[PDB]
Motif scaffolding. Sequence first.
Motif, PDB file in Angstrom:
ATOM      1  N   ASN A 178      53.274 -22.899  34.896  1.00 20.11           N
ATOM      2  CA  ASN A 178      52.337 -22.895  34.151  1.00 20.11           C
ATOM      3  C   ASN A 178      51.108 -24.062  34.574  1.00 20.11           C
ATOM      4  OD1 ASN A 178      52.413 -25.164  32.314  1.00 20.11           O
ATOM      5  ND2 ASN A 178      54.226 -23.608  31.462  1.00 20.11           N
ATOM      6  N   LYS A 179      49.965 -24.001  34.334  1.00 15.04           N
ATOM      7  CA  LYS A 179      49.216 -24.895  34.722  1.00 15.04           C
ATOM      8  C   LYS A 179      49.352 -26.424  33.981  1.00 15.04           C
ATOM      9  CE  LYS A 179      44.567 -23.368  34.735  1.00 15.04           C
ATOM     10  NZ  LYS A 179      43.575 -22.718  34.430  1.00 15.04           N
TER      11      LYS A 179
ATOM     12  N   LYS B 275      42.529 -18.725  37.218  1.00 18.17           N
ATOM     13  CA  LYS B 275      41.318 -17.844  37.500  1.00 18.17           C
ATOM     14  C   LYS B 275      41.123 -17.837  39.012  1.00 18.17           C
ATOM     15  CE  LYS B 275      39.669 -18.969  32.631  1.00 18.17           C
ATOM     16  NZ  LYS B 275      41.198 -19.059  32.769  1.00 18.17           N
TER      17      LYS B 275
ATOM     18  N   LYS C 176      44.206 -21.711  17.324  1.00 18.26           N
ATOM     19  CA  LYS C 176      44.261 -21.433  18.810  1.00 18.26           C
ATOM     20  C   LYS C 176      45.005 -22.666  19.120  1.00 18.26           C
ATOM     21  CE  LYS C 176      41.594 -21.206  22.973  1.00 18.26           C
ATOM     22  NZ  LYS C 176      40.586 -22.490  23.318  1.00 18.26           N
ATOM     23  N   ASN C 177      44.601 -23.828  18.915  1.00 18.96           N
ATOM     24  CA  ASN C 177      45.267 -25.251  19.085  1.00 18.96           C
ATOM     25  C   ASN C 177      46.686 -25.009  18.564  1.00 18.96           C
ATOM     26  OD1 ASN C 177      43.156 -26.606  20.365  1.00 18.96           O
ATOM     27  ND2 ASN C 177      42.703 -27.323  18.591  1.00 18.96           N
TER      28      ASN C 177
ATOM     29  N   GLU D 210      42.407 -21.261  41.671  1.00 17.78           N
ATOM     30  CA  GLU D 210      41.178 -21.917  40.772  1.00 17.78           C
ATOM     31  C   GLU D 210      40.740 -23.166  41.029  1.00 17.78           C
ATOM     32  OE1 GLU D 210      42.241 -21.442  36.747  1.00 17.78           O
ATOM     33  OE2 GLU D 210      40.579 -22.736  36.039  1.00 17.78           O
TER      34      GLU D 210
ATOM     35  N   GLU E  71      53.036 -21.924  28.585  1.00 19.71           N
ATOM     36  CA  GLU E  71      51.545 -22.076  28.247  1.00 19.71           C
ATOM     37  C   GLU E  71      51.189 -20.761  29.269  1.00 19.71           C
ATOM     38  OE1 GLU E  71      48.986 -23.817  31.125  1.00 19.71           O
ATOM     39  OE2 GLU E  71      47.776 -24.576  29.384  1.00 19.71           O
ATOM     40  N   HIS E  72      50.034 -20.210  28.806  1.00 18.90           N
ATOM     41  CA  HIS E  72      49.780 -18.757  29.265  1.00 18.90           C
ATOM     42  C   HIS E  72      48.525 -18.579  30.192  1.00 18.90           C
ATOM     43  CE1 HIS E  72      53.367 -16.791  27.672  1.00 18.90           C
ATOM     44  NE2 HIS E  72      53.067 -17.243  26.598  1.00 18.90           N
ATOM     45  N   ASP E  73      47.789 -19.818  30.007  1.00 15.57           N
ATOM     46  CA  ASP E  73      46.350 -19.829  30.582  1.00 15.57           C
ATOM     47  C   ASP E  73      46.515 -19.645  32.299  1.00 15.57           C
ATOM     48  OD1 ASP E  73      43.609 -20.436  30.979  1.00 15.57           O
ATOM     49  OD2 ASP E  73      44.081 -22.146  31.811  1.00 15.57           O
TER      50      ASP E  73
ATOM     51  N   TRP F 132      48.837 -22.963  20.716  1.00 17.98           N
ATOM     52  CA  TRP F 132      48.887 -23.481  22.138  1.00 17.98           C
ATOM     53  C   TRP F 132      49.885 -24.789  22.099  1.00 17.98           C
ATOM     54  CZ3 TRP F 132      48.230 -28.149  24.087  1.00 17.98           C
ATOM     55  CH2 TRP F 132      48.054 -28.327  25.493  1.00 17.98           C
TER      56      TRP F 132
ATOM     57  N   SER G  87      44.187 -31.995  27.954  1.00 17.91           N
ATOM     58  CA  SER G  87      43.479 -31.720  26.851  1.00 17.91           C
ATOM     59  C   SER G  87      43.855 -32.332  25.482  1.00 17.91           C
ATOM     60  CB  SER G  87      43.526 -30.052  26.519  1.00 17.91           C
ATOM     61  OG  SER G  87      44.830 -29.757  25.638  1.00 17.91           O
TER      62      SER G  87
END
Length: 430
Positions: free
Chosen positions: A217-218, A309, A291-292, A113, A304-306, A295, A255
């Motif tokens: 995770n990312k 891509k 959502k936040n 990604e 974290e699941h993102d 997260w 973020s």
Amino acid sequence: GPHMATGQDRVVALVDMDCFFVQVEQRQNPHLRNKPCAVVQYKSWKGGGIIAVSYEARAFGVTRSMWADDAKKLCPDLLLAQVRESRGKANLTKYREASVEVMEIMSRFAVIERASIDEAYVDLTSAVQERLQKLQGQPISADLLPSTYIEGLPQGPTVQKEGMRKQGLFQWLDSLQIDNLTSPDLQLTVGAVIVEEMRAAIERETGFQCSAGISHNKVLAKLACGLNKPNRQTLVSHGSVPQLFSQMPIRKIRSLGGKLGASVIEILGIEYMGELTQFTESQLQSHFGEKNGSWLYAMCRGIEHDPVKPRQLPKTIGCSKNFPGKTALATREQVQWWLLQLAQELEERLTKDRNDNDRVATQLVVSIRVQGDKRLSSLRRCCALTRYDAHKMSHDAFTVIKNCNTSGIQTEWSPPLTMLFLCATKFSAS
DNA sequence: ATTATGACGCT
DNA sequence: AGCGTCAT
Ligand SMILES: Nc1nc2c(ncn2[C@H]2C[C@H](O)[C@@H](COP(=O)(O)OP(=O)(O)OP(=O)(O)O)O2)c(=O)[nH]1
Ligand SMILES: [Mn+2]
Ligand SMILES: [Mn+2]
Ligand SMILES: [Mn+2]
């Protein structure tokens, strides 16, 4: 307990080029290598604005966003390379092409990604299973991890940096259960072996050095990447998260460095990521949204699941220029000339993109800022992008923005424009 | 007068 | 769709 998901399913890496634009210039000009040096845009105003800084120059306090004249006060011997100018504006093509070099090498190891011009996430889960089945339960030698740090180690019961790195790595490898092909720590370790190989390939084949993070995770991979720059990689295990987060300012997590992070700190009366664990998921959702809140509840536990891509190419191709202070555009001739300059660069980049990547953009986004507007974008309007022709694109952009001119006089432009931005979007295969 | 991007969330 | 936030 046995059903508490621990977010350890994946192996994710983040590879980020060290001081990227500087390295691109140092490759081209050997006189800049192993020197305090920086890359600047423009020159007239206070020597130009620095956008990238070699680690030698960082030792003097030179940073991104600094004016070159001020940087020279900190570092009189600072060397400078200027971004190319074409059609009156900064042109970043050299660095985009260098980025493609690196992204293509990374893509040989796994789907990546593209997260920025100089960084990419890698999902190594499958490659790790592969290498594990190839290893046949054989332990991992420290020799396979020559630039790897294990965050949190050494710990427990010599004063050099490489020695502490090796000590930590030895403790980590001594703790490993190399017979369990499903052990997350082992999977991360094999991931780090692969990332050593990827980073070696990037340096061998481009001359560029990079750092990397390896975790589950990312967000943790990104955080890990930053822990031991330059030219090193860092493994952040699930188990390292409590101690790491117990003194981690909330703003350090991707973020959370802006308004939302400031609101977490203010509303909850906390400072560090680890302090978030004391709130329920519903409490966090009540303050920060569904959502936040979900997260944050997971992220402060290392989860974290993102997804990474599958996307190696940028989704948009854009051209922008600020016209600050007294350079603001105040006539129609001026606005039209600069729309044309931006559109000609856009056409050149779009035509190359279509040849390289078998796609065409279908939407043109036109953004401006007017003098006195606090926001970075004052107005944003789309129109159809049906042909890669700069004259058509600039005419359409003008047509889309022409009523923002408050001037009854059609020759003048008021209020003057302090930014123009053209962006091609909504790509379709061709 | 940190500049040039690029991603993504909200409504 | 247009705006805002994050990032650097
Ligand atoms: N045009 C422009 N380019 C920027 C700006 N900020 C960063 N860049 C470019 C130049 C950097 O070399 C490149 C990658 O940024 P990074 O945040 O990864 O930093 P860099 O690689 O320079 O140093 P690092 O070793 O990763 O800390 O992006 C900016 O504000 N404007
Ligand atoms: Mn970088
Ligand atoms: Mn980066
Ligand atoms: Mn940086």
